[PDB]
From Swiss-Prot:
Result of changing R74K: No effect on ADP-ribosylation
Protein name: Ubiquitin
Superkingdom classification of source: Eukaryota
Residues annotated as site: Interacts with activating enzyme: R54, R72
Coiled coil location: none
Post-translational modification remark: Phosphorylated at Ser-65 by PINK1 during mitophagy. Phosphorylated ubiquitin specifically binds and activates parkin (PRKN), triggering mitophagy. Phosphorylation does not affect E1-mediated E2 charging of ubiquitin but affects discharging of E2 enzymes to form polyubiquitin chains. It also affects deubiquitination by deubiquitinase enzymes such as USP30. Mono-ADP-ribosylated at the C-terminus by PARP9, a component of the PPAR9-DTX3L complex. ADP-ribosylation requires processing by E1 and E2 enzymes and prevents ubiquitin conjugation to substrates such as histones.
Outcome of mutating H68A: Decreases affinity for UBE2R2 in ECS(FEM1C)-UBE2R2 complex. Impairs ubiquitination by CRL2(KLHDC3) E3 ligase complex. Impairs ubiquitination by CRL2(KLHDC3) E3 ligase complex
Outcome, altering R54D: Decreases affinity for UBE2R2 in CRL2(FEM1C)-UBE2R2 complex
Portion held of the full protein: 1 to 74 of 685
Length: 74
């Protein structure tokens, strides 16, 4: 299972994941790929704000889904 994360510049990160992976896990994988601190990362899928402790399957993120990194505002 893979997902795509688009960064704020539109760069695509491809990640190997499993349904149960937490969003926290995903943030760690993005840190490794791009050096973006997890505390600076805000993810959305299908307009939904994704919380660190919930899983990809909790959000119905599927094979080949795209997530966006969006502005950390405050
Ligand atoms: Zn496993
Ligand atoms: Zn995992
Ligand atoms: Zn695992
Ligand atoms: Zn920090
Ligand atoms: Zn999009």
């Amino acid at each position: 299972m893979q997902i795509f994360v688009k960064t704020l510049t539109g760069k695509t990160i491809t990640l190997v994941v499993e349904p149960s992976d937490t969003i926290e896990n995903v943030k760690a994988k993005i840190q490794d790929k791009e050096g973006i601190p997890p505390d600076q990362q805000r993810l959305i899928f299908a307009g939904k704000q994704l919380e660190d402790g919930r899983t990809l399957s909790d959000y119905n993120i599927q094979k080949e889904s795209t997530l966006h990194l969006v502005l950390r505002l405050r």
